[model samples]
Target chain A: DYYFLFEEKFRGSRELVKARLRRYIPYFKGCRRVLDIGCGRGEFLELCKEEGIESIGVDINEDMIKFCEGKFNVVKSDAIEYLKSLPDKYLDGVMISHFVEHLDPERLFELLSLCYSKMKYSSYIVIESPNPTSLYSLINFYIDPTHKKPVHPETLKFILEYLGFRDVKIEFFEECEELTKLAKIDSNTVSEEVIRVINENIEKLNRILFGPQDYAIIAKK
Target chain B: DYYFLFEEKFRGSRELVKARLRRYIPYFKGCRRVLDIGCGRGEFLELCKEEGIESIGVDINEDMIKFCEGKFNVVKSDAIEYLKSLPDKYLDGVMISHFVEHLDPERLFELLSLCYSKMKYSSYIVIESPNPTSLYSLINFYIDPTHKKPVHPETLKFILEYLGFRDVKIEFFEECEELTKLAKIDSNTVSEEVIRVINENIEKLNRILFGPQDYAIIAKK
Candidate 1:
């Protein structure tokens, strides 16, 4: 009861999540089998189906797996344990959105290490999570009762690189462009140099105050 | 150059290795894919084929892989690295004959850990190595140039159980029966009790000095 209520309340509607996850579609387009971990409501797998990309969804929650069963290929199993059941290098890509923060460092490392082994050479790995650097993301992080913590983009990138992945790139996304930028003073009420420096710091403050809420680390094996 | 010579002279003639490996055939006879690691000369894989069991051979030696390529299914890659290329739980059985002794504990643990993940539930695992507890086995252990160390049967069993395998049974084979057993002689007329004691330790000495040359661990996942 609480899960569905929280899912609807905090995680946004199913349609909103589908739209929010649209950006990940390009990365997995044309994959033979792109595995989506923590595929709550099968949002990402639904997106994969949109592009005709064959994909399987995995989750630990019985409810989530049951809900997605008839619609998409989904399985209920521990995150790392399920990967063990897959063939190494069998996945052309792996999609894990809003999943890693649920794991502590130990499990995070295990998941990354196994992902490196399971992914084919030159295959894509996409891990999306709340950006720890942003206070806004943290606000969202603590609101979810199930979240363990937030993952810093740099830490995720470093671990992925250490696990033998290549070309790791951190992409900040969502709600950044819509943020209001500080306006420059039209009247020279202050000195020109002073006004310029004041507006510069204001823009900096805006970015720091309302930075990207989520980040995705894109890497290749 | 020396490998082929050692394989023939010390390891055994190809035919002899095949006959010796025959004991492992039953464990993997019904498997969908029985993987043979460090498949030097592809002896085990050949045995698998003779039983109509589909199997693949993996070896690090370029020459060894090349030799077995056209004749059987084989790939040249590091033992652990090659397992990463396969699907998880894809193999119904895994066979590593005369291979574990070549790995140090670190590599050995890595290999064992991976084999556990790759094998399906209820799958069989067979590991054959020199019996370090036997003086005769140790003599053969050091004869090979590439071997890293001998592994004790108990240590192997403990490791297998620790790594999540079940029903681990150690099977000792070859040379033990051929060793001379102490006889109770008519000299027992000198002193029945003393002769009995002397002959008792002699049987013990026979096992310590000339026990089985090889032992294989049969285990399940």
Candidate 2:
């Protein structure tokens, strides 16, 4: 009877979560109002607060909403339901962290459109999720039975711009050092030609095994 | 710089955690005093509360202590340090949930010895953690940079009894359905002999890839 065993086993600790999400705070710096969708445990929201970025969160999970109560401003509702209720040009920034993976393509489109409509011109939106390029991450991704599919970085980048975030690009981070790190075959024991051949294949193997674990699409309306 | 990016991406939602942990609750039922080690987010503690089992938690993580503050009895201290401070026979039950994965053999031995000293005779102790027998789980296990090693069910069970918990055994749970589920080949297209050969291989493959994701050892002191 673990209250939030999912977070304990799968998500990780608040300190680690904060450390990983802290990299995105700079994108929302100086913003007056930001929205964090699927802000599980409010790591980004708390980071936004310390940086003086006024942020609100929307998560439909009952325990998450209560867990974040008083510490941050969060409402429990469907992401689109919360987004549709916002006024036009209302938000200064928007963030969808590790959330889009759970969304259907249609809902992702609808949500992106809503973010674009409600965000002020030139405002930023950071969409972070598992990078499908890494084979190891893909293996870990399906562990979450709720996940519909993994979104490729290029697909997300293209979609963000397609939904009217004029300046759209993908930023990759969180290296899976253990599983994907390059093999270090002793060079002294092997011929230079052998080393060269092995090194080339190592690069390809590393790309498949150790590519970035996660990526963020930083776009501006 | 994610705050607790590890948990948000890795652990999971509270509801899901609660549901998964609910199975372990009956083990602690009616206990007057219990202790949960590495009690990340105090999931077991909250569950204990609902069942009227007086429980406290100890975790070395700073963020975890603050996160569980006021909601449950949790102390932010080194696990061995805290265990040393407890009086003999202070606890009726001791639960080490997912915490052992972070410890080395020496520390694990020391912690178990401390638990034997602190817990009452005939009291129950449930030690739950990742099962190394599952290859998929082993892959996920190394994802945590801080992990010292994975504890096999047989090794943990033997260690617990050797440390003086007279009755000890392992309980396996948490199936990796997506990865380990059996393949359903078309029966009409395949001959009976083909099905037999494939099914035998499938069972062997499933054992290595899809065995239980987690396990618990419910031992009596």
Candidate 3:
């Protein structure tokens, strides 16, 4: 039901797709084969094809898979089952964007293990999801009834490390510009301590009201 | 020469001093006696007196001491020597702002120890100075020819802890408003990640180009 509405409103614009996919460029550098799990609308696959990287996609949504078929290799299948069927060390990189929060803890863990086992050593695994640290993000995340549960950055980092993924770095992205403007004050007029207190308060409030709405974790196998 | 020129330009407006002193209202609550060292123009003492708190000031600058004498109790003396002359457990609180960076390390440590030995249990010591983390602060710190060196927040925290001060908290204050305005962005049009990347880059650049210019540390014995 969520995707039905999601596709109608948030299938995402080409510009949005390009902006999201561009962040992967650095990680995808030197990668020969890449897999995009839950490849909604196949925007990433389109980008990969343009970049000349051998790329494929998997999605449970048959309609989405069908739409992407002529342009890229895509299979209509559950991500976990497809990943499980792939041979060992099959991919140079694995990308899962806005997907993990849909799965239960056990399935999430299983998918992580599968990704770890399926990728070559030193291959990158990039996971992008709605961040829970921002109060607005937590509120917005639940608006979608399909979201299984919110995952904390610390918990994700811990899981990745436990699964033997190395170099895990959490990049908090997204901010409310309206709140960021509150931090600007002239230090020359007020004492520095006063200004700092004001700025610090602004940041604390920003986190509560408009924190980074999403975060991406980049890890190496 | 700096103070001579500084007095002409920045003896500090009464409003500026009141703004700085107002932040300490919570800390000074329930306190009777407080001492302001290097009380250049006795701005803090004036504010304390208005609040019905008994206050005194000490400064080696004869002209400044004379200027403060008619309205408040002020002594013409070096800070360390005067603190050394006082009996143990004599004051409720001590404030030293923009003073320590002028002293050599030996004198600074001695003054800190003297403040510790002279104050009652639970008494507060507030130290405010230029924050080295901000690039502009580092550049401006030595603008006063008398400045010996810039002190880092961590180093100051360590020293305060070593001197037996408890609950030491560093407050980073003061910023350029122009830079804060730069952080404001329209999140609806662009992806959250793009806005975050922009905000983050602004903060990083703020630290390098226009970071918080001043920091304060409040500690209790």
Candidate 4:
């Protein structure tokens, strides 16, 4: 019931998901197998079918895996447990999107370590989460009652690097322009000192009010 | 009348300009004198007053100089001519904001060279301009009928280095988030091939549609 409500609010159309996921294909290059943890409605599996790439979906939700049954090779299982059962270096790439913020910090750390152990040399791990830098996003982060904690880009980047993931790139996406406009000012006749004080306050406010809403980190093991 | 309208549309409140200029004060540290080329309303000069630093303003517009006369030490002279009259290695710092885009490419090149000649060793030259990489900013750029051309960050960075300016840094500010949201996607389940195709198009679209709106280059001679 929670997931049903969650899907209604958060799930975009399958067509949109396919279009969205299309940009990440290059990371799977030269790989025959891939894994999608918390595969949701199997939107990714459908795309995998079209491209003829062999893939598997793992989710704890029985309903989600059941819904994906006919169209995908899916197993209803806890993500970490399933991952632990897989042989080392089983997948060419691993993708987790909008799913990391739901796990407790310790579990999240364990999961990343497990993924690293299972990933082949030079394989890729891509993680996307709501950015906490933006004040608006911080509010939105709480809207979903299931979210464990907001993840900072630098925090995640450091952990991945420490775990031996190389070539980490953190891409900031979805800016808030309306807030930027609020910070815009024209200072033709005002005294510099007065203007300086005003601008300083505004700069501080802008960061709290209008930073990026989302970011994705891509790393290779 | 044109200048009046330009000021109304493009200029922010004096408080805002001082605030904007204040952040650049540290760049002028240890300097006793500075020159603000195209000093329009002399906001920078007023700030210099409070900082106990000596500064002068140069502008071609008689009205602008007349308006600034009471509060600032401003001269009604062409920027290049005023710069030429100065002795070599005279100024501690030079500031050019929203002025470079108004000059034809040849004149722009000439002005930088002259500014280089006027600046002392270790003196700073700060240049701010509209970024052309963003589609929205390109529209904003044309709102000013007098703007001759948009300068890319790399283009300015290169010219300053070639002219013997060291320690050059390019800072990007004021992003447009609306366009960024339009290009966002999720690809956890998509195949490598299909994701590859989708990502390439999105990458292309991002550059042409959603680049940063403005950037500044800070260089030291």
Candidate 5:
């Protein structure tokens, strides 16, 4: 059941999401060490290592962590708790995906503070999550059933700032945006006049629908 | 200037926008009572206000709204002139995002008519524009500079119905979701008020000035 749930959440073509992240590879270019929280299958960690960066993952799930360590150097521990144990300013970058939303706000903040203490002032925390506004997300996100709650770009930004992070960056999949447009307005048939109306209510429309299905943010303390 | 503008526009820093919205976090809980009519310089007002059971906005400028709400209540407002004044449905939901292009031959007929009659079935109105769907939009979205027209989603839906397209969904689009999100906000952040706020204190600065740099809406009337 656990693997099924994990696969359900992580199993996806990921073509679009991967493409979106590729745009940020330059930001990760020079990092020598990387930490992945909720490393899942450790694919990203492995990718980082391939890029010549030293990478490791920490996960509460012993079996998954063991599998990752066997494949690489993943550590078996509660991510939030483990991050706190690290000495201050020890990492070049921290990568996380679909993990932060599961924690209570208090714990999330605590973990972030710990992360902040362990990273350089300009180092980053890279995060990725299903956009609250994407079609696949609408269809499959709720399917996880284990997801505590969904996070929006606005909410994530708030949490990051509260933790004193600076210069947060977010990225979205264009296909998701396309799907949102497809879901809310039929772009194919939308006329110049309808286009004009859309111009009129762009902001209002965004709030009601098109909450991104995927979210990614990178920031530093 | 161009390079600086690029950095500012694509700030790649969401902390500023997120912090601003976080201040009003409690307001976005649901679609109840909000309106962002052609919500230009009014993104925060719409995102943070209560427009009724539905949050609403309408704009002739999709870019402006997109910048403000970051996918919050926004609508493109070509058909919005009439859509904004919707009465029959007492909107539980309404928003628009670059909705101007939705106008078709049929939309012109019902756009204003629906606004006046207060159709019971009609509950929300949203629009978006800049109509950035194709290569032409890429070249032309910023060409006119002063273009001031937007369309409404409901009006387009109504038009699609008139044109015999059933169960149609509406959506406003951008070439890159992340770029779109940051670009709009970045443009607005340079507005006079936001500049004033920033000059005062970097940490306390969280406002994006301007009434809708390019323009759009999210109307729930």
Candidate 6:
């Protein structure tokens, strides 16, 4: 598919993305396993490996998983359905980056409850996607031909809090950190220093990306 | 007429009314020649006279103007039409309490422009009526049998600004000061201090009785 091609040719952009995601790495230490739902081609998975966060990825597309498994241990499955397959209180962190914008309220809630059961306390379900408050985000949130719905901050908070998740913290990020990390190869593995910098300023980085483009929510089950 | 009886009962609640008009007095300093358009029984103008603001009254009803003559300068004519009769920039101030709600946009704009031309620069247009933001005001603002339209704050400010008056400040007053003063009449004359104390906290009052009622536009010509 054209999306796979886009991912292959622009894999270098993933480094820049790694740096951007660097801010979220500290929380990764406590996370025994990380699940990136809708892990399109595992660009983020590659970074999760670099961070030493035990991780797995799942996507509906067989070809996406096939490509991802070639480099990372991603499985071919529907992300939400895969999350539901896990035992209760299973994972330490569940990263649903950019996946929630595609789910309707009913499905999203089911997915959230599934994620909550699979997540341990202090372990978080992290979500990153286009912020609805921005005009661009509001306009096309549901236009991702495959996306079923868009999540807004206020509405999303209401949903998460209502589901009994505590300490629901939302941060804004601009662009994916995976893409940032891949942009520049440091002759060695992804630079930990760059990752450290990006991780430190995830909030400000998000503000820059969408002028408030990105929204990340981390909550305890 | 049913409207006549309704209005009669409305005016019958008058000793309770003059107290409401008395609240706007302190805003006037060096202000004279106050005009109370649509003066129902000249209660407002009488209060103005008590404060030494040379007061006059106008009404379309001959009977109402007749009732006004001995106590204030009474004019038996339409308020806007009578406003046109005065010289350009003539009056120091014009009070149209509870009157403009009965006119349509064309007549309303015409009268507003006339007020701008007739009142001297920086002269106050003391407007006291049921506040537009309240449910009672929204309903009752157009409840007058002869009422042409509801005067909303948005529409009022728009018309005033469109007519070239600057410095338009709309105040929301709840628990009509005049009515409060009138209630105190049985025990003692409502002093200026009491009226001042009641109206001084317009912001808090807006939160209480009207929940954002009553707006005044003190715009300069």
lDDT of 6 by residue, B1-221 (tens): 32234555443455656776666776554577666778877777777777777767789987777766876788899888889899987787777877776665678788878888888776777665567565334433432334544577777788888888778778775544433221111113345675456445533433432354466655565
CA lDDT, every model vs. true structure: 0.77, 0.77, 0.76, 0.75, 0.52, 0.65
Query: Candidate 4 at B28: error in angstroms?
Result: 0.8
Model 2: chain A TM-score against the true structure = 0.92
Choose the strongest candidate by TM-score.
2
lDDT at A50 for candidate 5? 67
TM-score of structure candidate 1: 0.49
Q: Model 5, range B145-220, lDDT digits (tens) per residue?
A: 2223334345556654563333455543323333232122222323567545533442121112111222233322
| Minimal lDDT window, size 10, model 1 chain A | A179-188
Error of 3 at B3 (Å): 74
Off by over 4 Å in 3: A1-11, A179-183, A187-189, B1-221
TM-score of chain A of each: 0.92, 0.92, 0.90, 0.83, 0.78, 0.75
Task: Give the per-residue lDDT digits (tens) of candidate 6, residues A180-214.
Answer: 33232233443455444334334332332234556
What are the DockQ scores of the candidates, in order? 0.00, 0.02, 0.01, 0.01, 0.02, 0.02
Ranking by TM-score: 2, 1, 3, 4, 5, 6
- Model 5 off-target regions past 4 Å? A1-10, A13-21, A133-139, A177-195, A198-211, B1-221
Our model 3 lands, by Cα RMSD against the true structure, at 20.3
lDDT of 1 by residue, A1-221 (tens): 43554577666788888998888777777888788989988888888888999999888889999889999999899879988887898888999888887776678888988888888887899998887675445545644434554678898889988988989999887754432333333433335776577557645644554577788899987
User: What digit string (tens of lDDT, one per residue) describes model 5 on residues A32-110?
Assistant: 7678888866767766766777777887777677667766888788887787778787887888777865554435546
What DockQ would you assign to candidate 3?
0.01
TM-score versus the correct structure, for each prediction: 0.49, 0.52, 0.48, 0.46, 0.45, 0.42
lDDT of model 3 at position A26: 80
* Reference-based lDDT, residue B145, model 5: 20
Model 6, A200: alpha-carbon shift in Å? 29
